[PDB]
């Protein structure tokens, strides 16, 4: 896969109001050790809060999903405003809070929620073209809002939040931790990790199928 | 590993101003993947400055050590001053900036370097009891401000910072990034990650080799 370019869309630093750091980072060491290249990407914009870690209360603070995501991929990363579809062969998003607070709003909107437009744009880019897309942990949430159409997806076992994803117009599908679930008509591959994972090499078993899914369905 | 209880030393959240966060991310998937559990720690205090990862730039406010790296950690996580060291069977220390800023002042000091004394009480409980050490990045420039002996070890191939080890009472010894060294008598792996690595693959290789070899001084 040298030579493959796999978008990868981020909206903070760390579970609670940004980015889940291990799915992040997961997904980056897959794209690579396949020997792709991922191009990352985020919103130039202010959180929709700060979380203290670790107590899981609000701080007093503001901060940029821009700024807060290079952490991750070390200062690597551009404005998701810059995007350009026709470089990119694949997009994934990886899960957290972030992706439910400032991709989207659907942790206080639910099925009414709406979508960052700029995500909307580039994910209905990819799927005009045949470009796989790869959404990770509650991401998939943002999917019916995105696609005016049903689509295969899941976001693990939980029937609350597969009730509330059908409700947008998606047929859900129960998937385990290490495993994944394809809409090979969409090209749109979904894994729960997160939701349903007890530790890190759980979410990694349905992480590197979800990529090496990925990988397969852009060639 | 069942059983086996590997310590894990942060000092933030990303390379600039804390742990670098795909050595930390590599570090715990290492040790999940063998069966052992992380139990991390880190100080509780506040960082030496608050970088933006975009531009390398300071920034104007404070952050806490402990409560930015519970972000890596999806909130568990312990001041570095509870740690007890009958309950762990290893130590490991990823790199960042954080390690040379946060967990000692080597990133202004050089080899007139501090460390910070819940630090040196743990590592050196470890030697002790015979515990081994995994060092990665810059971190193993703490190890000769620590132990007052000589230590085989690498931050992999850059000669200035080999040069200031040495001073410090070091034998530093030449490494590439897919591979380790190893002090056999005093139990204590370094490998160089993120000194030489171009991609988190490249990275992960050397971290995984350490890890590895950690979990076997362990037994």
């Known amino acids: 896969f040298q030579g493959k370019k796999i978008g990868v869309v981020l909206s903070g630093c760390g579970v609670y109001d940004g980015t889940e750091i291990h799915e992040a980072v997961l997904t980056l060491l897959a794209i690579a050790r396949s020997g792709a290249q991922a191009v990352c990407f985020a919103p130039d914009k202010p959180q929709a809060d700060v979380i203290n870690h670790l107590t899981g209360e609000a701080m007093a603070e503001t901060r940029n999903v821009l700024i807060e995501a290079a952490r991750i991929t070390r200062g690597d990363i551009r404005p998701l405003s810059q995007a350009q579809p026709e470089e990119l062969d694949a997009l994934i998003v990886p899960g957290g809070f972030g992706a439910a607070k400032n991709l989207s709003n659907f942790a206080s909107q639910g099925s009414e929620c709406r979508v960052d437009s700029d995500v909307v744009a580039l994910a209905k880019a990819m799927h005009q073209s045949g470009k796989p897309l790869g959404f990770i942990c509650i991401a998939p949430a943002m999917l019916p809002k995105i696609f005016d159409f049903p689509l295969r997806l899941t976001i693990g076992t ?4 597969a009730e509330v994803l059908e409700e947008m117009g998606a047929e859900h599908v129960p998937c385990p931790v290490d495993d994944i679930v394809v809409d090979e008509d969409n090209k749109v591959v979904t894994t729960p990790a ?17 990529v090496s899914r990925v990988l397969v369905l852009a060639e």
């Open 194 to 210: 997160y939701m349903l994972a007890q530790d890190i090499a759980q979410a990694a078993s349905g992480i590197d199928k979800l």
């Open 158 to 161: 939980d029937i609350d939040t």
